[PDB]
Structure 1
Amino acid sequence: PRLYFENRSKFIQDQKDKGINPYPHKFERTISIPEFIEKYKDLGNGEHLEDTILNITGRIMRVSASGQKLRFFDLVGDGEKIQVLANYSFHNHEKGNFAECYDKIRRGDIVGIVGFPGKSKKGELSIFPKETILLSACLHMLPMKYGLKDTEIRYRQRYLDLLINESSRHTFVTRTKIINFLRNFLNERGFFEVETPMMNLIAGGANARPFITHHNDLDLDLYLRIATELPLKMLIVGGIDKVYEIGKVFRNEGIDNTHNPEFTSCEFYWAYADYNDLIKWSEDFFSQLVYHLFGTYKISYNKDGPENQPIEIDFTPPYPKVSIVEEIEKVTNTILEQPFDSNETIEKMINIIKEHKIELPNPPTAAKLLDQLASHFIENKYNDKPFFIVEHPQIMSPLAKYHRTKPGLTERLEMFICGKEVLNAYTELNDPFKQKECFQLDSAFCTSLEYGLPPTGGLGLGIDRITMFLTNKNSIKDVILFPTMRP
């Protein structure tokens, strides 16, 4: 109970009162636990290297019952494990009673050890101490091997999740491996990474309620970025022809499984590229990244929870392209004539929505009805492959350049994986006269457009959702180390 904490705390003072330092300043270890496993895993059973003295550190995770002369522990570090085998005959009795010194050790204690490497008779690789020193004590009782499935402890105290549940470490290692692979993928193709402001006087290139915060001395209100699209395109104007940013953005809406207040986005802008360049980019990149992580283009994913049978997602390129308006017009068996915000085709969409018992949009704007219609009739089209929804109407894509053969449409693409969007890209609108809100946009961006934005293609990736799919998670809370929670 809380008695355990009280008792370990008082134990700590007792050691201080005997002039022992239960938190020493520095311990020079010679080798990591992984390095140890690598160098000594091929020893023979019962074999010892009793003249090779090592200093090693780790956390005690298992304490097995005292024999008269032998003590056994599990020691872990960097997500790996060796055994401690403390034998009375090898103990340097000059530095204290064997029994009392190893009786102090508790599960969760961090120790440093002076000893030699060797194996059990049974063959277990272990370090044989001569001396072990407490280095930092764990004052509470740690959960047991499978005792930590309570989500709240894993998110409000992720150090425990990282210590107990083997998988979580792999999940965040895989997250970093993905961001590394993305950085080096853009870097090898001549792209140039930059940092643009988190605070501005306007929210950027999407639609979302912002976070407001007050700069005091300047007595102004600033808004957290909802995207990076605008300053990065300005940098394209400045002749940084391949540019990207990997960092946080903020959107002040509701938490769910695919949506967190702050999330990690990566945007890139690519001068003289277009829609088709970006299609191939996405095919290239997801296929290579999956193959880089798994040795295959096929992975398995628990779309409907770990309680249910998973599905196979195949990242083999090319992926399918589905035209949003045409495909809605084909599934619904109706025809939507432009303008899409006609009174008549707005009412046609609203009748599709009422007839299929689909919820209707808070304001029934054409863009929001088309969005809802795609959400119900397309976005779960393919669940065994990523696919692209393409050629969105101009009324849904205020910064996408107009389609070069299909009037009213844009050269835009979104990629979906199990029906959740991971990717948003288009041929960038670069005619300042056609960006008709220059008469969530600001004059600095629009003015920059008048200096000549070359024909460019831009892409934005949801890093969190991609990580979810590649680490078999159903909630964004499992790929963010410190998800934000209600108290």
Structure 2
Amino acid sequence: GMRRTHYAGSLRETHVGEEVVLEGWVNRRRDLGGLIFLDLRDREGLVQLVAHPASPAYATAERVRPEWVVRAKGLVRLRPEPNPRLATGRVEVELSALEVLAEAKTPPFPVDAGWRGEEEKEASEELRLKYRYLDLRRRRMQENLRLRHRVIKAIWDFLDREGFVQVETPFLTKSPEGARDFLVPYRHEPGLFYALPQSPQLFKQMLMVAGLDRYFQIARCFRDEDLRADRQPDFTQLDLEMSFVEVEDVLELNERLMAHVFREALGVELPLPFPRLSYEEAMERYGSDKPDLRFGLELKEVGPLFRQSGFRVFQEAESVKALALPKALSRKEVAELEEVAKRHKAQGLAWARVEEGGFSGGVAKFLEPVREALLQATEARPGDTLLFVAGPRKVAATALGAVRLRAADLLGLKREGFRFLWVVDFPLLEWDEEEEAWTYMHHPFTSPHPEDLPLLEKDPGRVRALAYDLVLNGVEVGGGSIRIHDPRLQARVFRLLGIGEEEQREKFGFFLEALEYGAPPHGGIAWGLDRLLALMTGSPSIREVIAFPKNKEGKDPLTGAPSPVPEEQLRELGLMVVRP
């Protein structure tokens, strides 16, 4: 068997007196009165080795430097004084033998602090990526990757128990989730390409046409986007699909799955069921379709209070939303929130102060005439600051919701734990304020609400979709919908989305043909697994939970990708780079 008798970090006082064989890295060396103390490290943590001048191990111990790899043999003994910061801190290994398995030069940044329970100083992330195989030696990074393992295994255990079949779907496939495709040139016929899948969407629906009833996959997705907002060129989804389901069936299975994952991998109990908010409810109350429920400060509609007001900017607005903050803001901070508001298309931010009887600052003058109704509507107390955005309903909600989020940081609100929620009853179409156009919030295979089918031709903007988003702590961690299984309806919805019969055949003809062979009712969802793991670990970026990620420009400092290829190779593909 193995030479190793134990993981180094697993030794305890119950092993005192045993002879052990250990293998690991030298976390740190210190010399004292002729003794050589080596902190030996493996994935279970540190244990102290002691090399005595009279031991045969001593000559070898004198050569050793940090990050060298050694095999050590000796007797577990109690330390005269224990180190309470270490799990092995009561014991040490009295070395009888020591062998160097590998030498090492000094690393470009330290990896030893976290194994001692000490705080790690911030290193340059471009350097950590360039030497990612050293960065991954740190305890925090190994914890992240081992949590990732435990989450996926929990997912397999639960979905296997629920009868889901794991199916691996293609990577070299047909050239659809609202991004650009990554292409792969076909070598034998220049001008031909594969595309990497933006998601397995069409394949998992075909697996329902095939009668497998329920599917899942830990799927890699590839999307060529502006990597703004911590995007990686490829990323991981828990993808799943079910047959003969309504929305509620998908929502309940996912809730139970999430509670299982959090229980088994984090030791956290998630109360069930998750809260549910409709799209309109979410934006009315929070000004966001990804509400952060870790704090209050809900938005209130006060437009109907100003229909007789001399303040034309309020009186003409479709909506005036208000938010009461429990603090008297400085003029600098107010201007900061005003800038946030203006960055979200608002015409501006109004403000005032609540005092014992009257109001002070900003627009207080125009607030005095409606004081009684306003205080009942906002629940504001003396010392608060009231903020207002006036305008069209979606802008006013969205602008003051972003002010709300920013203000939680300014006020230092303690936001704790994991607050999941479903957002449901999305409209089928979203209005692009900029491009003056209708676009789909979810992909084109999302089923409209069956009660709304006659509105597809009469009034498309009132049409509800059978779609849903899963939100965690103000972050979208999942999204899905019930699908269209009638080929007539899917073409009808394609026509509505501005897709003629020619484009339908060229992009989706194979899938529309599949719908004519008896497609069952089906629906599904996909989680953003990297996003979820980042939240579960409190990481600032999904790069902390991916073993070998790209940097922010989608480049790989570790390997040098992306890079040129030999001119010979590029000519074999029958392509050339166009001259600027």
Deviations 1:60-116 (A, max 9, x none): 111111433x22110011131111111233427xxxxx44x3221111100112333
Within the alignment, does 1:391 sit opposite 2:457 as a pair?
A: no
How far did 1:281 drift?
Answer: 1.9
Distance verdict in 2 for CA 1:187–1:420, change over 3 Å: same
Deviations 1:366-419 (A, max 9, x none): xxx999898657798998722222112223242111213456111111011122
Distance verdict in 2 for CA 1:387–1:147, change over 3 Å: closer
Instruction: Report the AA paired with residue 394 of structure 1.
Output: L
User: Quick one: which of 14, 17, 23 aligns to 1:57?
Assistant: 23
How much is the aligned-residue C-alpha RMSD, in angstroms? 3.4
**Matches of 1:189 and 1:375, distance apart in 2:** 39
Which runs of 5 or more structure 1 residues have no equivalent in the other structure?
1-26, 93-97, 298-314, 335-347, 361-368
TM-score, scaled relative to structure 2: 0.63
**Matches of 1:358 and 1:62, distance apart in 2:** 50
On the 8 A contact 1:28/1:55 being kept in 2, the answer is no
On the 8 A contact 2:344/2:398 being kept in 1, the answer is no
On the 8 A contact 2:482/2:524 being kept in 1, the answer is yes
User: Quick one: which of 256, 271, 284 aligns to 1:316?
Assistant: 271
**Matches of 1:372 and 1:240, distance apart in 2:** 44
On the 8 A contact 1:43/1:119 being kept in 2, the answer is no
How far did 1:177 drift?
Answer: 1.0
Within the alignment, does 1:31 sit opposite 2:97 as a pair?
A: no
Corresponding residue of 1:216: 187
Corresponding residue of 1:119: 78
Distance verdict in 2 for CA 1:246–1:349, change over 3 Å: farther
Task: Report matched runs for 1:266-345 at 5 Å.
Answer: 266-297=238-269, 315-325=270-280, 328=283
On the 8 A contact 1:79/1:169 being kept in 2, the answer is no
On the 8 A contact 1:400/1:411 being kept in 2, the answer is yes
Aligned identity (percent) is 23
Equivalent pairs counted in the alignment come to: 404
**Matches of 2:244 and 2:525, distance apart in 1:** 14
**Matches of 2:398 and 2:232, distance apart in 1:** 20
Corresponding residue of 2:479: 424
How far did 1:127 drift?
Answer: 2.2
Deviations 1:458-478 (A, max 9, x none): 111100111011111121111
**Matches of 1:234 and 1:184, distance apart in 2:** 24
Corresponding residue of 2:99: 133
On the 8 A contact 2:154/2:265 being kept in 1, the answer is no
How far did 1:213 drift?
Answer: 2.0
Corresponding residue of 1:109: 68
Instruction: Report the AA paired with residue 421 of structure 1.
Output: E
Within the alignment, does 1:254 sit opposite 2:288 as a pair?
A: no
Task: Report matched runs for 1:68-87 at 5 Å.
Answer: 68=34, 70-87=35-52
**Matches of 1:199 and 1:457, distance apart in 2:** 24
Distance verdict in 2 for CA 1:189–1:195, change over 3 Å: same
Q: Is the deviation greater in 421-430 or in 404-413?
A: 404-413
Distance verdict in 2 for CA 1:179–1:226, change over 3 Å: same
Within the alignment, does 1:457 sit opposite 2:457 as a pair?
A: no
State the secondary structure of the residue aligned to 1:450.
Answer: coil
User: Quick one: which of 459, 469, 477 aligns to 1:414?
Assistant: 469
State the secondary structure of the residue aligned to 1:292.
Answer: helix
**Matches of 1:370 and 1:250, distance apart in 2:** 35
How far did 1:454 drift?
Answer: 0.3
Which runs of 5 or more structure 2 residues have no equivalent in the other structure?
83-89, 114-118, 286-299, 304-316, 322-340, 346-391, 409-414, 430-439, 456-462, 495-503, 558-580
**Matches of 1:483 and 1:263, distance apart in 2:** 9
On the 8 A contact 1:234/1:448 being kept in 2, the answer is yes
State the secondary structure of the residue aligned to 2:33.
Answer: coil
Distance verdict in 2 for CA 1:161–1:439, change over 3 Å: closer
Deviations 1:155-191 (A, max 9, x none): 332332232x322221111111111111221111001
Instruction: Report the AA paired with residue 200 of structure 1.
Output: T
Corresponding residue of 1:229: 201
Distance verdict in 2 for CA 1:371–1:440, change over 3 Å: farther
**Matches of 2:529 and 2:204, distance apart in 1:** 18
Distance verdict in 2 for CA 1:167–1:328, change over 3 Å: closer
Corresponding residue of 2:235: 263
TM-score, scaled relative to structure 1: 0.74
